[PDB]
Each structure stands twice: as structure tokens, then as C-alpha cells.
């Protein structure tokens, strides 16, 4: 019984811990699955619930559900350190030793330093972390009416111009209707803000995509400003840079959709990182260290064709799964490693609900069809690790 | 050609103007009707809305809705002053000149100068103050799941044990499960604590009802601490007095019923004023003019029987607005009419969705009885002013 420790139920993790699961049977090895909550989140989805467009619930599943007892063994706690000398893991309420690794620790907010950001500026990164959004929005709304004059009480800033920030702006826009008339606001008195420090919206993107979102969002009422870093984030709003000279917005709400880095736990258990993400071997592995394997956020792989990395991805993340689930259930038996090779589909971000653009297979995709692809797309992710079961609910 | 001008419209005034409405044969009267809101809240239901267990908009009525702008003139404006001796009433937007004035401001908070009650706890007195009441809870409880160790954002003060403490304390008690679920809280860990500086809880109430009412919600987990004043309010919570020595409650929602004043405007016109109320005449009218009428919270009338002042009531608000319309429609026809003769029906207390207390008629009453009695006299309130589609709605 050779023990396979995974780091977190997220896409790579849970996905990797499913694929060990039906490729191996019982007393092969002892498997143990380490979460920080019971329950396993839908990532892609988090934009939604944080504006308020979809409850929260349907962005999560439980984990013991998924799995089965006998073959992995979960363990909710939280991850604090790794050594590698020793093969422990340390938890905040216990101990786990480990003959294979797989570390699938998601990302922290990557805040560049920017004063105040960490501090003040909410992030979408988990369930309690969008429900906060959530709350703190419709708690300023309902603050307005007693005092109209805090008109920075209707203005959300949301930072960075980016997939996260443009799906989050567009399901802000569809809210804000029922929002206004649920708390007696006006809504030409809200503002909607996404700032970008680059000179495009949507970087790396098809410019055409780039105009249509713009267009779409703007109609509803999103403002950008592009080229326009955050100086500062204070309690009260954020400070700019405009034209080399400092400017403030007075918001109530500030989103920080800027970047992700590694989570700090790998980076601070020794690993040579890159934004604080490993840059892995051709089998996910960590350099110099035959048993230990990154998949997800935490993994940094770099395109052939080009040179730039991989983007940190959910898709990317279960292709990682996958691919370690086959490896480690073929080194356990004895057996001979396959190569991870990325297999990249397109990929669709929403304008709303009822919005969307892309650019799937080689094709631009606008509108319900995008829409429609983007929900289906997500639906097989589901049928994947729960099966129609899960699709259902 | 005479012109009736009507300040508020709460029970009394709105009562007051519906009945003008069906008494006079329209072109005889120019009534005008202000309003700080373009909507009628039914003020006996707030405390639903404050806690979460019914939507707002279930306490309130468009005010166009219910009148003819034939007959009466609506005017959505904020009253700053009067001025008795020009005949005028003076508006944020604008000035008004009356024959006739009925006087409905309501309520403002009593806090009797208790330091940093009224800067940092919320009181239970429109529909704007119970959005944000209900929407402070919530982003509280939001905000526990990430920081469990901040146990006062699951703790409720609320201050005074009287009719309204006791209704909120109750509906509170009754959404603690549904919004545990809601955040992933361990309902064991929510504290709903009503503080009283009288020796019992519901003072001046007959004790049966108090000990059903204590037994109840005290099976709902609300805990009482009874002979215990308030010393300071703080935005982390309450400082109270025990056993004559201060002891300090964390908690990041402190609610206000202790007490109400009259509106301060009807002080600041001039008026002479106890505890901010008139003391009227017995066609509830200000000494001594003859063209004021008062209604609701701001008049102060004393039982000639029992010698009490009576308690500030939407009942005898109702009966006030019925009278005043009666003896206004009669003055202006040249009829000369009756003295206000009050009869107050019994009070029913809800203690949740499915129970309340009360003395009807003469018998004590519990449970679904009271419950359905309760209802009943609201829906006797919605028939009048809005009549069988205002009762289905
Ligand atoms: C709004 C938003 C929209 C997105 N839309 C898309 C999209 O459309 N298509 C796409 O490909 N990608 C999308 N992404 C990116 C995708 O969500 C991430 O790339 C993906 O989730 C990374 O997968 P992961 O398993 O590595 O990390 P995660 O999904 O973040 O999972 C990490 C897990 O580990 C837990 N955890 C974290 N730290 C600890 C710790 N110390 N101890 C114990 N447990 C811990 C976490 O609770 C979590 O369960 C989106 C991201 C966001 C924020
Ligand atoms: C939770 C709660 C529960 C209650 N339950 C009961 C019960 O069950 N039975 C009972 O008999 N009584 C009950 N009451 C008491 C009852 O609500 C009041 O006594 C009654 O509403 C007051 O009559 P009113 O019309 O003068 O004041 P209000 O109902 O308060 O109306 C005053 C009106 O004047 C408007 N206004 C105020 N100031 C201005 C301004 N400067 N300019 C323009 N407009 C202004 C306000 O918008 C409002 O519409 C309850 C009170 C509360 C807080």
C-alpha cells in the first residue's frame, strides 16, 4: 500500500482523485484527498453568484458525494506547509506522510504590490469569498436611499479588464435592473467601472471579440478605462493614473480581477517557482523529485509553437488530472509513463446571461450560440465527475 | 376653494385622506397630500422585512395607487417646517399654504441620550431602515464563514423588550435556520440577545402573556437579559450594566427599540410639545388653533378612565384619520360634527410565522388563534384603504 496524498478538491485535484479511483481497485493503494471545505466549488462559475445572477448552491458540489470511501479517504483541513525531506504534509490539525504527491493548491491573488489592495479589494476565489461580494453590494444599495448624496455607494470598480473582469462586469450589467428596483435606486446614478493598466481591453484577444464585448458592455452601462493602472486602494475608493497624474474614484466596492499567482504554500515549501507556479517536467512533475506532481493553477507549462506559457486554466487543469491519474495508477503497477500533451479547445466568455463571445474551433462565436457552447461546455465538466446525476441538478 | 393640505402619509393621514376622499363630492376641496416617499408603508409589518421572513414590498402600497389625483393632489416632497402664524408648511423643493392642516409625521427614535445609540444602532421605522437592517444581517453572516473565529458577527442585540423588540426578536428567531443555511453557519453559534433596562420582559403587560411569550421564544434560542440598561453603543457592539458594573457584548448588529418621541419637527415649529407629542383637544386638534388637526404618533390623548396617556398605535392612528376626515368633510359642508371618541379593540404580539399573544375583547390568546386574529385586523386595515384587490395583493 503505497500512499498518494492529494492537496486540494479543486479541478485538477478532484479530477485526478476520480481518475485514480476508476483506474485502480481497492487496497492498490491508500489515497487520501485534502480539502480546506467539504465540498468542492465550480470555479468558472464564482462570477455569478458574486453579482447576485445565480445562487451560490449551484456552483458546488459535495465531495464525499463524488467519491467513494472506501478507495480515497477525504480529509477536510487546511494545507499549511510541505517537506519534502521528510514526505509530510503539514495540516492546521494534523499530519499526513506521503510516497506520491499531487499538489493542487488553486491560485492566490496576485495584487503586485499595489498598496492597500489586499487589504480592501475583494477577490473572486471561493464560495464564502462571492457571497461576501454579494452581500456587500446589495448592503450599499440598500444604504443609497437613506442617503442619496453617497452616490459612491452605486459605484463598483472592478480591476482589471481581463476574462474574470469582463464575465463579472456583464453579469453585474444583467443585475442591475432587478437590483435597482429592488432597493428603490436609480439606475442612471450607477456606475459600473473595470480598470485595465493595459492599453486593450481583453489582451491576447481577437480585436474583433475585444469591440463586440465593448460594445455589448458598454451599451449596458460598463465604463472602461484602458491604460489606467490603480496607484492606491483605500477604504474609500481606489486612486488612479491618468494622463502621469493622480485621480480618484470614491467607490464603496472594489473587485480585484487583476492576476492570479501559485499558492504560496508551494512557493514557500521550497519549490523553484515562477509566479509562484512550478514550471513541471514532461510527466507534471516537479523538477528533482521523481514522486511529486502540480497540476492546475499551481502548474506552468509553456506552448511549443509559440513561447509565451500556458494561461491558467480549468480545462488545462483537467487535462493535469487526467494525465496524473494514468501516470501514478501506471507507476504504482510497475508500468512506463505517458507525456502530457495540452489538448486546447476555445474557450467562451459570457457578456451575461444571455451574451457571449469566443473564438471556437478556429471560428469566431458570438451571441446565443456562444452563450449556448459556453453552458454546454460546462455542463460536460459536470456529466465528467458526477455524471447525468449532477447535470440534472 | 378651501385647501386641506395633509402632512404624512401614514396611517393617520392616509386614513385621513381616503375618508376626505369618500366624504366630499370632489371641486369643494383642493387636497393636497406630502410625502417624504411616493409609497404608504404598512408600518406594523417592518419588523418582517428587518429580519428577513417577508418581502418589503408586501409592506407598502403606491400612494397613486390607492387615491383619486382628481380629488386629491399628491406631492412627493420632505417637510421641513411649520409656520403656524403665515399659515404655511415649508418643503425641501418647495412651500405650501393651508385653511386645513393635518399634522401625520409619525415617529422619530428616543435614544434619551445614551452615547452612541443613535450614531451606531438601527431602529425599525420605514422600509428603507429595514433594507438596510436585513441586508447588515446578511452581509454579517457573509462575512462569518471566512473569519469564524468573529463570533459577533453571528450576535444580535436588540435593545428594549417592549412590543416591537419582542415582534423583531421573534421573526428573527424564526429566519435563523433558512439563513445558517444560507451562509454555512453552525446555528449553535448565533445568539439573539433582547436587552431590557425594565425588571421583566414586555413591560406593563399581563405576566401570563410575558411567560408564554419568554417560554416560546426562549425555546427559539433567544435569551433575555431583563434589569439590564445600556450604558454605551460602539460599532463592535453594547456596553450594559450588571449587578451595577459594566460588562461588554460583542456584537456587529445593535437594534433600537427602547423608545419613540414625536417627530422633532412639530417641536421645532413652535409647538408646545411633551416628549415631542400635542396633547389635543377632544376633536384632536393643537391648542389652540382651530385649522390644525394632529394625527398618529404626534398627538398625545389620556384615557378620561384610566387617567394613562395612550400608547402611540396605528389603531387609534386609524380611528384619528376616520375622525378628522368625518369632522373636516362636516366642517366644510357647514354641519358642525363629533368629538373623537377612541375604542381601542385589543393587541395581538406575534411571536413568529406560526404563534402570537394577546388580550382580545377581554380573553387572553395564544398560538393560531392570535395568530389569525393578528392577521385579520391588518387585513381590516388593508380592506380600508385599498379595499378587497388591495386584500388579495
Ligand atoms: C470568475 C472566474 C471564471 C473563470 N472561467 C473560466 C473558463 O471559463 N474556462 C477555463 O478554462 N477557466 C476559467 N477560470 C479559471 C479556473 O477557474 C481556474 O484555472 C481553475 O479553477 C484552477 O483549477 P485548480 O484546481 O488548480 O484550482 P481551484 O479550482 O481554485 O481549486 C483549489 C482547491 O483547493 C482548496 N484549497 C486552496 N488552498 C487550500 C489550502 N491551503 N488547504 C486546503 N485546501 C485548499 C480550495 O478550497 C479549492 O477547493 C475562471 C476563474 C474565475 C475566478
Ligand atoms: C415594528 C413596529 C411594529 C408595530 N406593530 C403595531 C401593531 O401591531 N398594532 C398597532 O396598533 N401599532 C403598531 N405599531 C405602531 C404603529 O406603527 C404606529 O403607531 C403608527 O404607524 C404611527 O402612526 P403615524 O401615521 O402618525 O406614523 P407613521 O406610520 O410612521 O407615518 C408617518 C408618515 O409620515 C412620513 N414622514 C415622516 N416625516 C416626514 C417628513 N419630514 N416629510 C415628509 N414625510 C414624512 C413618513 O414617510 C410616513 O409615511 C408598530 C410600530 C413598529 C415600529
Request: net charge negative; proline share 5%; hydrophobic share 40%.
Amino acid at each position: 500500500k503505497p500512499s498518494i496524498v492529494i492537496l486540494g478538491a479543486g479541478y485538477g485535484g478532484i479530477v485526478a482523485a476520480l481518475g485514480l479511483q476508476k483506474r485502480l481497485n481497492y487496497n492498490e493503494a491508500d489515497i487520501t484527498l485534502v480539502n480546506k471545505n467539504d465540498y468542492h466549488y465550480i470555479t468558472t462559475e464564482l462570477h455569478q453568484p458574486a453579482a447576485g445572477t445565480m445562487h451560490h448552491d449551484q456552483a458546488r458540489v459535495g465531495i464525499k458525494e463524488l467519491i467513494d470511501e472506501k478507495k480515497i479517504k477525504f480529509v477536510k483541513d487546511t494545507v499549511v506547509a510541505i517537506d519534502r525531506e521528510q514526505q509530510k504534509v503539514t495540516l492546521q490539525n494534523g499530519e499526513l506522510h506521503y510516497d506520491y504527491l499531487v499538489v493542487g493548491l488553486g491560485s492566490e491573488p496576485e495584487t503586485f504590490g499595489i498598496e492597500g489592495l489586499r487589504e480592501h479589494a475583494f477577490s473572486i476565489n471561493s464560495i464564502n469569498s462571492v457571497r461576501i461580494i454579494r452581500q456587500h453590494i446589495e448592503y450599499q444599495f440598500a444604504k443609497f436611499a437613506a442617503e442619496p448624496e453617497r452616490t459612491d455607494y452605486l459605484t463598483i470598480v472592478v480591476g482589471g479588464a481581463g476574462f474574470t473582469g469582463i464575465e463579472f462586469v456583464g453579469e453585474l450589467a444583467d443585475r442591475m435592473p432587478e437590483l435597482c428596483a429592488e432597493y428603490d435606486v436609480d439606475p442612471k446614478l450607477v456606475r459600473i467601472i473595470n480598470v485595465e493598466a493595459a492599453p486593450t481591453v481583453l489582451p491576447g484577444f481577437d480585436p474583433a471579440l475585444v469591440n463586440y464585448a465593448m460594445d455589448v458592455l458598454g451599451g449596458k452601462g460598463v465604463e472602461f478605462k484602458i491604460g489606467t493602472p490603480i496607484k492606491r486602494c483605500t477604504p474609500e475608493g481606489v486612486v488612479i493614473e491618468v494622463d502621469g497624474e493622480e485621480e480618484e474614484i470614491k467607490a464603496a466596492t472594489v473587485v480585484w480581477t487583476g492576476g492570479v499567482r501559485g499558492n504560496s504554500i508551494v512557493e514557500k515549501s521550497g519549490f523553484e517557482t515562477m509566479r509562484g507556479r512550478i514550471k513541471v517536467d514532461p510527466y507534471l512533475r516537479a523538477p528533482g523529485h521523481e514522486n511529486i506532481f502540480i497540476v492546475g493553477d499551481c502548474a506552468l507549462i509553456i506552448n511549443e509553437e509559440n513561447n509565451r506559457p500556458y494561461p491558467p486554466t480549468a480545462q488545462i487543469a483537467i487535462q493535469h488530472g487526467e494525465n496524473v491519474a494514468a501516470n501514478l495508477a501506471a507507476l504504482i503497477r510497475g508500468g512506463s509513463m505517458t507525456p502530457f500533451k495540452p489538448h486546447i479547445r476555445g474557450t467562451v466568455a459570457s457578456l451575461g446571461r444571455n451574451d457571449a463571445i469566443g473564438i471556437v474551433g478556429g471560428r469566431k462565436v458570438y451571441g446565443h450560440a456562444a452563450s449556448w457552447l459556453k453552458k454546454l461546455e460546462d455542463m460536460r465538466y459536470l456529466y465528467l465527475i458526477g455524471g447525468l446525476s449532477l447535470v440534472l441538478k
